[PDB]
Every structure is written in structure tokens, then in C-alpha cells.
């Protein structure tokens with residue numbers, strides 16, 4: 010059965026720091042981009058939309074522009090790593106990570122910032 | 125590009141009636157049930173989780189037990205029709221439908237419940 014896995018449900022982090030929220034999905038041998046969809050939202054704000062290898066900066070929410078990046082390096086290891094840099098207080102909430110890979114699941118991640 | 129469609133984004137529904145909120149997705153004349161996933165939530169509550177031509181009931185939230193039905197009849201027309209029956213004020217809110225069908229999208233639908241005296 011297809012199932013998205015989350016190592017850490019809560020992220021405690023600082024203002025101005027860099028965090029990498031992670032989501033594991035089952036990669037068999039070699040990653041078929043033609044089946045892979047990854048989508049991170051937070052409160053219905055589009056943070057990453059990767060569909061079959063294709064992403065568009067224009068569809069990213071204003072809040073998250075130029076700061077927030079899916080790490081492609083990690084995807085062949087079965088890991089949608091969302092990396093935000095220069096973290097702000099307005100970033101903080103329930104992030105949702107949705108993977109499709111011949112089968113679909115999501116998981117929620119809470120993020121608290123300090124200072 | 126794969127695109128889930130919503131005929132109406134608001135529904136005004138009577139108390140004690142039945143509502144059928146609809147999400148349209150593109151079918152290229154094919155059933156292909158093993159690639160179709162449909163999921164409705166509302167306020168983090170799982171309402172339907174349809175997969176391999178079968179509604180998975182253990183993951184479904186029991187506040188929606190015996191009252192939420194996905195209309196399977198409608199799916200070959202490219203239409204996840206969620207039918208809730210015996211509509212209450214708690215059923216007002218933002219429903220989210222997630223379709224995966226070689227291509228993935230979601231849409232929100234608002235439901236306002238009215239009870240004339």
C-alpha cells in the first residue's frame with residue numbers, strides 16, 4: 010500500500026534561520042518523474058507545485074517567494090524536502106505535503122517560530 | 125493540464141434535506157478505476173476515501189457514517205458526486221475534494237446551511 014511518511018510532526022525553529030521540513034515516499038528502484046506529483050500548501054497558500062518534473066514560480070504565494078524550494082537532490086532518495094530559508098514569524102502553522110506516485114497520500118506538519 | 129472543476133463553489137442547502145456537491149475531473153472515455161483516487165474532507169474530517177473502485181470505510185470518520193455516499197454511477201461521466209444526507213448545521217463549512225487520475229488537483233466548496241422557521 011502507498012503511504013507518505015513524516016520523520017518530524019513538529020518543528021521548533023528561530024527567526025531568520027533555515028529549516029527543512031521532510032516527507033518520505035516509497036521509491037522502488039529509479040524515480041519515474043512521469044508519475045511524481047508533490048504539493049506543499051499551508052492554509053491553502055501554494056508553496057510548491059511540482060507536477061511531472063515541471064514547476065512554475067508564478068503560482069507560488071507572495072509570502073513564500075524566493076525563500077522556499079523543494080530539494081530535487083533528495084527526491085530520488087524518496088524525500089520531498091521542502092527547505093525554507095530566512096524564516097519569518099508569519100511562516101508558522103499547519104503545512105500539508107501531498108505526494109502522488111501511483112497512489113496518493115498526505116501528512117500535516119506543525120511549525121512554531123521563536124523571537 | 126489536469127484540472128478539477130466545480131460547477132458551483134457555494135451551496136445554500138436546507139436543514140434536514142440532502143445535498144449533492146460535485147467535483148468534475150477529465151475522463152478520456154476510460155473507467156481506469158485502479159488509477160482513480162477520490163478523497164473528500166471537511167475541517168480535517170475524512171468523509172470519503174475511494175480507491176481501487178471501493179470506498180475505504182475504516183479511515184472514514186464515523187460522524188459521516190451511514191450518511192455520506194460517493195455516487196459511483198456518476199464517476200464514468202468524470203464526476204465525484206459527494207451526497208451527504210440529513211443535513212445539519214455542523215455540515216456547514218469548507219469541503220475539499222482531492223482527485224488523483226494520472227494527474228492531481230483539489231478544489232474547495234463552501235456550504236451554508238439555512239433553517240427557515
Ligand SMILES: N#Cc1cncc(COc2cc(OCc3cccc(-c4ccc5c(c4)OCCO5)c3C(F)F)ccc2CNCCO)c1
Pocket residue numbers: 046047048053054058060107108109113114115126127128161162163222223224228229230231
Ligand atoms: N487555494 C487554492 C487552490 C486552488 N486550485 C487548485 C489548487 C491546487 O493546485 C494543484 C495541485 C496539484 O497537486 C495536488 C496533489 C498532489 C499530490 C497528491 C494529491 C492527493 C490526491 C488525492 C489524495 C491524496 C493526495 O492523499 C490521500 C487522499 O487522496 C494532490 C491533491 F489532489 F490532493 C497539482 C496541480 C495544481 C494546479 N491546479 C490546476 C488548475 O486548477 C489550490
